[PDB]
Amino acid sequence: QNYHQDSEAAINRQINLELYASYVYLSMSYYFDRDDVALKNFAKYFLHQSHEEREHAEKLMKLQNQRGGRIFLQDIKKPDADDWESGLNAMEAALHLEKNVNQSLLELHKLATDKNDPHLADFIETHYLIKELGDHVTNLRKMGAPESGLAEYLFDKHTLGD
Amino acid sequence: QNYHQDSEAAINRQINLELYASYVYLSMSYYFDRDDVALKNFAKYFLHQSHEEREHAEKLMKLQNQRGGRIFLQDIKKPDADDWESGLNAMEAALHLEKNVNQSLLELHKLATDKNDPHLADFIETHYLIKELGDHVTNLRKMGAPESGLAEYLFDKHTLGD
Amino acid sequence: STSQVRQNYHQDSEAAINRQINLELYASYVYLSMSYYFDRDDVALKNFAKYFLHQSHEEREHAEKLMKLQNQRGGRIFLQDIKKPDADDWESGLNAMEAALHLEKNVNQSLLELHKLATDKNDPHLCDFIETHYLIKELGDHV
Amino acid sequence: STSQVRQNYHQDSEAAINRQINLELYASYVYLSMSYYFDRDDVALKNFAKYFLHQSHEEREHAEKLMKLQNQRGGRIFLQDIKKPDADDWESGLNAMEAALHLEKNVNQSLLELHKLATDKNDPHLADFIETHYLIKELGDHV
Amino acid sequence: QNYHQDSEAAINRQINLELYASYVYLSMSYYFDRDDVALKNFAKYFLHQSHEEREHAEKLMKLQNQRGGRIFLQDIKKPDADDWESGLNAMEAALHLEKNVNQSLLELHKLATDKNDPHLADFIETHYLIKELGDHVTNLRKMGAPESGLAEYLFDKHTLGD
Amino acid sequence: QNYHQDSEAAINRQINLELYASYVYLSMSYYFDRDDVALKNFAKYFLHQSHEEREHAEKLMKLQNQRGGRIFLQDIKKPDADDWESGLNAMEAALHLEKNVNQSLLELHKLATDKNDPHLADFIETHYLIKELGDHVTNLRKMGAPESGLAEYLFDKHTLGD
Amino acid sequence: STSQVRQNYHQDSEAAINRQINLELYASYVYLSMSYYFDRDDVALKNFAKYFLHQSHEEREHAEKLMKLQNQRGGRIFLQDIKKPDADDWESGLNAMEAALHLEKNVNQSLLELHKLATDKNDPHLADFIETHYLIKELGDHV
Amino acid sequence: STSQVRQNYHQDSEAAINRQINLELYASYVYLSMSYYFDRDDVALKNFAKYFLHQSHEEREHAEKLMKLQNQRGGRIFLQDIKKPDADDWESGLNAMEAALHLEKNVNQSLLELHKLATDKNDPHLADFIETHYLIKELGDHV
Known about the structure:
heterooctamer; A: 162 residues; mainly alpha; Ferritin; C: 143 residues; 4 helices; elongated; Ferritin-like (chains A, B, E, F); neurodegeneration (chains A, B, E, F); lysosome (chains A, B, E, F); Ferritin heavy chain (chains A, B, E, F)
C-alpha cells in the first residue's frame, strides 16, 4: 500500500509547513520590535502565535513516531519578505499563510481516515485562528487603515492588549 | 364585554411584537460577528438585549394565561433587512424599533386600567432603553462617523466594553 | 465577491446551514409555545411547562452556535421567517408530545443530512462540528 | 425640531415638569434659609437646622430626578430664577416653622396636578413616575 | 464700624455667588445628560462640582452666623444660557465663572484680616479647580474641538472616566 | 601615570553631564504641567526619568570618593530651551540628549578597563532608555504625530498611563 | 500674551518665584556637594553624609512644589544655571557648617521677602503658600 | 539611511549578529531533530528526547534574546533559511550523540569570536551582553 507512505509523506510536509509559519510569525514579530515600527503588542501577538505553530509542528512529529513512520526534515524556508511594511499587511499575509498552511492540513485528514483522528484537534484551532485574523484585517481597513498610522497605534492598544 | 377580548388581542399583538424585536436584535448581533464588520462588542450588546426582549415576551405569555386568556401566536416576520450597513444605522433602527414597540405597549396600558399594573415595570424599562439608544445614536453622529470606520471601532471598545 | 476567510466550504452547505438555522429557530418557537400550554390552568403541569422553556432556550443557543459557525467559516446568514407553529392547541393527557417529540426527528435528521453532505464535499471541519452537534442534541427522553 | 427619543409626551407635561423643576429648586432654597437660622445663636436649635439642611439636599435631589426624567422622555430643560425666600422670623416657640408646610402643600399639590395632567394626556409612564415621586414625598416630621 | 457690616455683606454677595456657581454647574450637567449630546461622564463632572460649590456656599452661611452677622438672601439668577453648545464651551464658561467667583472671594479675604482666616481653605481649592479647568480646555482645543465632536467623546472617556 | 587624573577627570565630566540630564528632564517635566500644555502623564514621565538621572549622578560621586578620586563640580548649565514645542520634540531632544550623554559614558568605560566594571550595570539601562525613547518618537510621528495635537493626548493616555 | 488661568498674580511675584526656584535648586546642589565630602574616606562621617543627601532631595522637592505653583498660578518657569557652590574642599568641615548657616538664612530670607512682596500686592494665595513653605522649612536639625 | 537609536555599533557587529541568529536558529532545528530521534519506539530514551526538546526551545529563546538585542542597538534582522539538520546519514541508537559536541563548539565558538570583535570595535554593551549569554550557555551539557 501507498497509504502508509502517502500519509507519512503528509505529516512531513505539514511539519515543514507548520514550522515555516513558525518562522514567518517570528520574522513578523521582530518587525514590530524595531524602533521605526515600535508596536510592542503586534510583537507579542505573532510571537505567541509563533510559539503556537511551533508547539503545533512538534505534535505532528510525535504523531509520526507513534504511527511507526519516519521524520523527514526539510529546510525551513525564510519567509517571503523580512519587511512587512504595515500591521494591516502583516495580517493580510498571516491570513494568506494560515490559509495555505490550512489547505494542506485538510488533504491530511481526508487521506488518513483514522480511528485516532489525532490532528482533528489542531484543525479546529487553525480555523479559530483564521476568523480572528479576518476580524483583525477588517477593523484596520475601516479605521481608514492602513496608512493612517494612528489607526494601527490604537489597534495595538485596544485590540491586542486585552 | 369586548374588554376581555380586546386585551387578549392586544396581548397577542405584543407577544408577537416583543417577539419580533428579539428576532430583529438577533439579526443585528451576528451582522457584527461576521468578518466584514467585526465588532464583537456590538455583537455582544444586541445578543444580550435580544435575550432581554425575549425575557420580556416570555412574561407576556405567562400574563395571558394568568388572566385565563388564550395565546394566539402569529408568524415572526423576518426582520426588514439582513445586512445593517453600519453600526450607526443599526442603532437608528432599533431606536425606530423600541419606539414603535413602545407605541402599542402604550395602547396596551391605556386599554388595561388594571389594579395589578403588571407590565408597568417593563413599560418603565422600554424607556431606559430608548434614552440609551438615542444616547448611542448621538455619540456616533458627532464622531464624524460613519464614513469614518474608525469611529465605529472606538465606540465598539470604549462605550460597549464597560 | 468572496469572504476573506472561506476555505473548502461549498455553496450547497452555506445554504443547508441557513436551512438548519430557520429550522432550529422554528424549534425554539414551538418548544416555547409548548411550555406555555402546560402553564395554562386547563393543564397546570409546571413540570412539563418548565422543561419546554429550557428546550426552547437550548434550541435557540443551538441556532446561535450555528450562526457563529456560519460567520466563522465566512458564509453569510440569510434568515427566513420563523413560521408560527402549524400546531395550535396541543392538549390532553399523554398528548401532543407526538407532534412534539416528532421534530426531534426532523431536526436530528436534517443534521444527519448535513452530515452526509459534508462527507460528500470533503469538509472535515463541518463533519466534526455536526457530529458534536448531533451527539449533544441526542438523549431524547428527559433530554 | 424634535428630539429623536420623544414618545406620547405632550408639550404640556414638558412645560409642567420644568415648572416643577423651579419649584423643587425654590423649595431647596427656602429650607436652606430656614436651616441656617436654627443655627444662629438667637435660636440655637441644631435639631432643626439638621432637618432643614437634609430636606434641602433632598428637594434638590428631587429636582434632579425630574430633570433626568425630562431629558429622558426627550424634552428640554429651561431653568428660571430661584426667587429669594420671604422669611425671617426663622425663630420662636410654636411659630414660623409650619409656615413652611405651605411649601409642602403647594409642592405636593403641583405634583397631584401633574398627575391628573398625565392621566388626561394618556402617558402611563409620566403617571407612574409622579405617583412614585409624590408617595416618596411622604408625610411631615419624624422623631 | 462698617467692617462688621462690610464683611457680613461680603459673605452675602459671596453666598449669593458660590450659590450661583452651583446653579450654573447643575445647568451644565444635564445639558450633557440630554440625548442630543449624551455624555453622561461629563455630566458626572459638573454635577459633582455643583455639589462642591453648594457645600461651599453652605459653609459661608455658617461663618456669617458664627461671626454674629446676618444672612441676606438674594435671587439665584438663572445661568447666562441654558444651552452650552460644546463640552469645550461648557468648560470655558466655568473657567470664566470660577474666575469671577474667585475675584470677589479675594475682596472677601483682603477686607477681613481675621485671626481665624476661615475661608482660606476654600480659596486654595478654587485654584486647584481653575488649573484643572484650563487643563481640560487646553486638551479639548488641541483635540480639535468642537465640531470634531469626536474630540469631546475621547476627552469624556479618557480624562473624565478616571 | 595620567590615568588616575584622566579617569577622575572623566568621572567629573559625566557627573556634570548626567546632572545636566537631570535638569533637562525637569525643565521638560514642568513644561507639560502648565495649563497650555497639560499632559499630566508626559510630565510624570520626565519627572521620573529626571529622578533616574539624578540618582545616576549621585552614584558617580560615591564612586569618585571610593576610588580615592576628588569631586570637581561644574556649573549645571540651563537646558537649550525652556519651551519644548511638542511632546514629540521633547522626545527628539531627550533622545538626541541621552545619545550624547551615552556618547561620553562610552569613552568612560573604554578608558577604565576595571576588574570591578562598576558603571557597567548603568550602561545596560541607558540603552534600555534609548530604544524606549525611539519607540515613543516613532509612535508619535507614527501615532500620526504630531500636528493633530490629539495624537499627543492619546499617547499621553495610552502609552504613558500604563 | 496672557494665560487663561492667571489671577491677582503680579509680574513681580512671577519673577521672585523664579528667583526662588533657582535658589532652592542651588541649595540642592550645595547640599549634594556636602554629603560627598563627609562620604570621602578623609571625613568618613556617614551620619553627615546621610543627613545631607536627604537635605538635597528635599530642597529639590521644594523647587518642584514651587514650579508646580508657578504653572498653578499661570506663570512661566524660566530656569537659570545651577552654579557650583563657592565651596569645594571644606577643610575643617566646620567651614562646611558655616556655609550652610548662611544658606539656610539666605533661603529662608528670600522666602520671607516673597512674604512681604505678597502682602504688598494683596495676593492672599501666594502668601499662605510661602508661609506653609517657610514653617515647613524651619526646624533646626536634631539630627 | 540610519536608525534613530544606533550608537558605537560597528556594522561588523550587526552582520555578526544576524549570523548568530541563523546559527542559534539552526540549533533549535537539530536538537529538535535529535530530540524526536529518541522518542521513536526504536530508541525509547524518553530522558534524552526530553532534554533535547528543552535545549531546542532554550536555544530558540537565545535566538530571541539576540534579535531583541539587534532591534535594541538599532540594527535590522535579516533571517536566513534554517538549514536542515544536515544529518549525514544517522538515526540509530548510540549514534552521532556527538553532533552536538561540535554544535555547541561552533555555537559557543562563534560566540567567543563575537567577543573578540566587540573588543576590537570598542563596543562595551555588545561585549557585556555576549559574556553573559555565553556563560549562560556554558555549563549545561549533562548530566
